Amino acid sequence: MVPISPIETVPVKLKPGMDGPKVKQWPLTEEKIKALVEICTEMEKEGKISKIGPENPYNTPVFAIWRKLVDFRELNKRTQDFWEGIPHPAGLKKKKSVTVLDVGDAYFSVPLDEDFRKYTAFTIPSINNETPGIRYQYNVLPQGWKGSPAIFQSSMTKILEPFAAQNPDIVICQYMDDLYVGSDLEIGQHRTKIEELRQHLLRWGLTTPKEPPFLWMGYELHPDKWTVQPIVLPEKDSWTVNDIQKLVGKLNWASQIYPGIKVRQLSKLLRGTKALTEVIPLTEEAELELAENREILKEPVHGVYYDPSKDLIAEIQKQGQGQWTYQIYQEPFKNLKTGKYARMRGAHTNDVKQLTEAVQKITTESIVIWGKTPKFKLPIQKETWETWWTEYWQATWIPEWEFVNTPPLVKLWYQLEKEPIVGAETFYVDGAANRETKLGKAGYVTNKGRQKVVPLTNTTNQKTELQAIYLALQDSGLEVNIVTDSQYALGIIQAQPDKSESELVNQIIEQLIKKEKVYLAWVPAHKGIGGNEQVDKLV
Amino acid sequence: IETVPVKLKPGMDGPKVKQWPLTEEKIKALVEICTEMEKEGKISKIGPENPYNTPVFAIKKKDSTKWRKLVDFRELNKRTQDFWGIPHPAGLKKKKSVTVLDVGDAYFSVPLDEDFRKYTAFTIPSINNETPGIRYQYNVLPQGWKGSPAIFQSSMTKILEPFKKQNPDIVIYQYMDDLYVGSDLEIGQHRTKIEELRQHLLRWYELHPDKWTVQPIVLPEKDSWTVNDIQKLVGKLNWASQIYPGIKVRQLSKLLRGTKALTEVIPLTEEAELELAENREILKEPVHGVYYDPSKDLIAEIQKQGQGQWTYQIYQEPFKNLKTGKYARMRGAHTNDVKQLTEAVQKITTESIVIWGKTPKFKLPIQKETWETWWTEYWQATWIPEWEFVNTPPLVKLWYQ
Numbered sequence: 001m002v003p004i005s006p007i008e009t010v011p012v013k014l015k016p017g018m019d020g021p022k023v024k025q026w027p028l029t030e031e032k033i034k035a036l037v038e039i040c041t042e043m044e045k046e047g048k049i050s051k052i053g054p055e056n057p058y059n060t061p062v063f064a065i066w067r068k069l070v071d072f073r074e075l076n077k078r079t080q081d082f083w084e085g086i087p088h089p090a091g092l093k094k095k096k097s098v099t100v101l102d103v104g105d106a107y108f109s110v111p112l113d114e115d116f117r118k119y120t121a122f123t124i125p126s127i128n129n130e131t132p133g134i135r136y137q138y139n140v141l142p143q144g145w146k147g148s149p150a151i152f153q154s155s156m157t158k159i160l161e162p163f164a165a166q167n168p169d170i171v172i173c174q175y176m177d178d179l180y181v182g183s184d185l186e187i188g189q190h191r192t193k194i195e196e197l198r199q200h201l202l203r204w205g206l207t208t209p210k211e212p213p214f215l216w217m218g219y220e221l222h223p224d225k226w227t228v229q230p231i232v233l234p235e236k237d238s239w240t241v242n243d244i245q246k247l248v249g250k251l252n253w254a255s256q257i258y259p260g261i262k263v264r265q266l267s268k269l270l271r272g273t274k275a276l277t278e279v280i281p282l283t284e285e286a287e288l289e290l291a292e293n294r295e296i297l298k299e300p301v302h303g304v305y306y307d308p309s310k311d312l313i314a315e316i317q318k319q320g321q322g323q324w325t326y327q328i329y330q331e332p333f334k335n336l337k338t339g340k341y342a343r344m345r346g347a348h349t350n351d352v353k354q355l356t357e358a359v360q361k362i363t364t365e366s367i368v369i370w371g372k373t374p375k376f377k378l379p380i381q382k383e384t385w386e387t388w389w390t391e392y393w394q395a396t397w398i399p400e401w402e403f404v405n406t407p408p409l410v411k412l413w414y415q416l417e418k419e420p421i422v423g424a425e426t427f428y429v430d431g432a433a434n435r436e437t438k439l440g441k442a443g444y445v446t447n448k449g450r451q452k453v454v455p456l457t458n459t460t461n462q463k464t465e466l467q468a469i470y471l472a473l474q475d476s477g478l479e480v481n482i483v484t485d486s487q488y489a490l491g492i493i494q495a496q497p498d499k500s501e502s503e504l505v506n507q508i509i510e511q512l513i514k515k516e517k518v519y520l521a522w523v524p525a526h527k528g529i530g531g532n533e534q535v536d537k538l539v
Numbered sequence: 540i541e542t543v544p545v546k547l548k549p550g551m552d553g554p555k556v557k558q559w560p561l562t563e564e565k566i567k568a569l570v571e572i573c574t575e576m577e578k579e580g581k582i583s584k585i586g587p588e589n590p591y592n593t594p595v596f597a598i599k600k601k602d603s604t605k606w607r608k609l610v611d612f613r614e615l616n617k618r619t620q621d622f623w624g625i626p627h628p629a630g631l632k633k634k635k636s637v638t639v640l641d642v643g644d645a646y647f648s649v650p651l652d653e654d655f656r657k658y659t660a661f662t663i664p665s666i667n668n669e670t671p672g673i674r675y676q677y678n679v680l681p682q683g684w685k686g687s688p689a690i691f692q693s694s695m696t697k698i699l700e701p702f703k704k705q706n707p708d709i710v711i712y713q714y715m716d717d718l719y720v721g722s723d724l725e726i727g728q729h730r731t732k733i734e735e736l737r738q739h740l741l742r743w744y745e746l747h748p749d750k751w752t753v754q755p756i757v758l759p760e761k762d763s764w765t766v767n768d769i770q771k772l773v774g775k776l777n778w779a780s781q782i783y784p785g786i787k788v789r790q791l792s793k794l795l796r797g798t799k800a801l802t803e804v805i806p807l808t809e810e811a812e813l814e815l816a817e818n819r820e821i822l823k824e825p826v827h828g829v830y831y832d833p834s835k836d837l838i839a840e841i842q843k844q845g846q847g848q849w850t851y852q853i854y855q856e857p858f859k860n861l862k863t864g865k866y867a868r869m870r871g872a873h874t875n876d877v878k879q880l881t882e883a884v885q886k887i888t889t890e891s892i893v894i895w896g897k898t899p900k901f902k903l904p905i906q907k908e909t910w911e912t913w914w915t916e917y918w919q920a921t922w923i924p925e926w927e928f929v930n931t932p933p934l935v936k937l938w939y940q
């Protein structure tokens with residue numbers, strides 16, 4: 001008998017201030033009992049468990065569904081913390097031959113720490129409880145133990161390292177119970193090396209036996225292409241919250257290869273959630289959204305594998321309403337993968353910022369998947385980005401990129417002047433409101449004598465401070481200077497939004513666009529600054 | 540050669556921080572470097588029974604193509620026991636010149652406490668999660684950890700004793716993996732003395748604090764003021780009144796009476812000029828009752844002025860600046876804002892280390908995601924300061940310009 005190579009055990013301790021778990025055993029039918037006895041007998045014969053006695057005051061419950069189901073819940077609550085994302089098909093490199101090997105009895109092939117075996121003790125209840133139950137303890141990694149996956153993974157890695165080092169002409173990916181071996185060698189050489197590998201694993205006592213296409217982790221992996229497993233979108237005349245969560249989940253999962261997937265109109269229904277039972281109707285926007293998603297999921301789309309000798313390209317398109325979509329490819333019309341980005345929750349925003357955020361996301365995802373930053377094709381002029389990042393108060397950066405002309409293009413809708421405008425009218429604006437009656441006034445006075453004060457019901461100080469500016473923008477020429485004492489309004493306008501949730505701000509923006517030159521000045525309030533008439537909006 | 544027992548703070552477990560994505564080249568560099576370090580007994584591979592992890596990445600120092608390994612020991616440092624205290628050499632900032640040296644190579648001689656090693660655990664990440672990350676833990680003193688210079692203080696004292704008994708006028712400070720050497724010599728004599736000290740360290744950045752001082756609050760000097768000019772002046776003075784007691788603007792605001800065009804020239808009355816003059820005299824004086832509290836945090840705010848110009852203020856209490864400055868330096872960064880910001884944060888942190896002995900907490904004018912995505916690509920320091928993100932445009936931007 002050839003000695004199977006010794007696998008060094010991993011020292012496991014319980015969390016400090018705790019001892020081995022002690023839970024009683026539940027009553028089982030005689031069928032279950034007999035089944036468990038028959039199982040544990042041959043399990044003992046194979047050396048996976050061992051008989052113990054009353055010297056071990058620790059015990060964990062066990063059921064049967066035959067299949068033995070040991071519950072290590074409390075032991076998991078007592079076991080220490082261990083270390084330890086799935087690989088993405090798009091990042092995988094095209095190989096000529098790929099073998100899938102699933103090791104049988106994965107956990108049962110790895111020895112448990114001998115000083116910890118005493119805590120994995122369980123008891124099979126004898127018939128009618130007229131005898132003390134049969135006592136057992138685990139000598140290997142228990143199914144359902146907290147530390148089993150990490151220890152098995154580390155063991156597998158330690159075993160695989162020399163074969164990998166000795167075989168640089170083949171690539172190995174390790175994932176849980178499975179090893180995946182790819183090579184560009186001839187099929188005979190490949191099969192030979194696979195047999196060599198499983199022999200090398202047999203030396204440590206690991207038994208290995210699927211063919212393409214591989215159904216793995218929601219993916220369909222073909223020899224030359226990859227995709228997702230068919231998405232099942234239920235059609236109900238009565239939707240619930242949980243159904244919307246499932247739907248959005250599946251849409252998200254499908255959106256990694258299917259371009260154009262929108263999920264905003266379905267995600268807006270998930271505010272005021274945590275009630276899993278409800279009936280929420282859909283808007284025409286949401287119905288058309290879901291119908292368009294069915295339109296995209298009508299015909300299957302596939303993605304290709306990664307080739308290191310070619311550039312990595314990511315192209316972005318604006319989808320409207322905070323939605324952005326992107327495609328990552330190397331060759332034209334042949335995507336590695338696709339994706340989407342939704343704007344963050346904010347009161348004010350613009351296109352350039354959202355595009356930037358999107359670029360950041362794609363960069364991080366790319367560095368994760370391929371280990372490099374892709375070149376970007378963005379719907380924004382070089383001069384636009386130039387002006388933006390040069391006149392922006394914040395620091396901002398986008399990696400190597402080029403302008404692609406596929407509308408709608410991201411542009412700057414208005415630019416405030418840096419200095420006061422000569423020959424332009426000067427609107428001293430102001431607004432105020434009563435805190436109690438919600439009655440306010442908003443308006444302006446100019447150097448040419450032009451005045452205006454508008455009375456407003458149901459309003460606040462900030463709303464009037466904005467309203468005055470809006471009034472100044474309405475009744476002024478193509479060029480205009482505006483003076484205000486509102487740090488709030490200036491704070492908003494300096495953030496340069498092209499879209500807002502407040503209609504007033506949106507209208508101010510729409511007014512700004514129609515202008516040629518706009519200089520916005522600021523002054524301290526109540527400092528007796530003439531022109532800045534606070535007394536005109538206080539009456 | 541003898542390990543000193545090191546523990547953690549009461550009621551604090553070791554650091555469990557997520558390792559962030561790394562590019563392929565950095566991963567290669569880390570693999571090579573850590574292989575070499577493994578062969579030298581500096582670090583060792585660990586099993587899955589080590590649940591602790593500290594972020595790690597690769598950089599490239601000034602005037603060097605060789606990749607360097609940098610560890611983000613921030614969480615471990617703040618979880619590491621407070622090592623006890625040598626008073627900060629206040630004569631260091633007063634010296635004519637100060638040179639920074641990297642004595643990190645000396646730490647790899649002293650072995651680390653065996654029980655404490657499991658807290659210095661880190662992981663080299665794999666691309667696309669195709670294989671489990673490589674796990675290491677330090678056997679010797681790890682660079683970046685605050686306990687390393689504290690442990691090596693005695694050794695460093697015994698080493699630098701002859702040089703300090705030789706040149707008592709040369710001030711020596713130590714922060715993390717860096718050694719600061721201040722003198723009043725000449726740049727040539729300075730460089731030769733630095734060669735002398737570095738070979739002195741062998742057998743066992745040129746800063747100029749004299750050129751770095753504190754800047755005041757100035758007001759424009761014109762012959763003809765416009766309405767806009769006077770308005771900006773009034774805003775700046777009103778803002779400055781939070782810092783200085785006697786700033787008044789009523790006589791200047793009196794000039795803005797009526798509704799005039801912003802570009803219209805207004806002549807200054809005598810009272811207005813008097814008031815402006817008095818305000819100048821007030822602004823020329825320093826700030827009243829401004830002290831440094833070692834028990835409080837240092838706050839550093841940075842504002843982007845544009846055209847490569849940045850401004851910064853270090854303080855502890857609002858409107859009580861301990862330091863002010865303006866980083867206009869341009870090297871290779873012309874087209875990149877984030878690089879400029881990174882270099883600025885580095886310099887400010889350096890000066891902060893020189894002056895007070897510790898690093899400040901930054902308030903950066905940048906979106907979290909942008910910074911978090913690109914700051915490591917331009918980082919060259921061995922230490923790492925704390926930071927938060929201000930995403931609301933400050934009005935005071937042009938008041939420091």
Ligand SMILES: N#Cc1ccc2c(Oc3ccccc3OCCn3ccc(=O)[nH]c3=O)cc(F)cc2c1
Pocket residue numbers: 087088092093094095096098100171172173180181182183212214215216221222223224305669
């Ligand atoms: N069931 C299953 C499963 C199967 C394979 C997985 C996987 O293949 C590889 C493993 C080792 C080296 C190269 C590999 O492939 C790269 C791309 N690639 C994929 C399939 C194919 O048929 N051809 C081809 O070129 C990598 C992986 F990360 C997970 C895998 C999972």
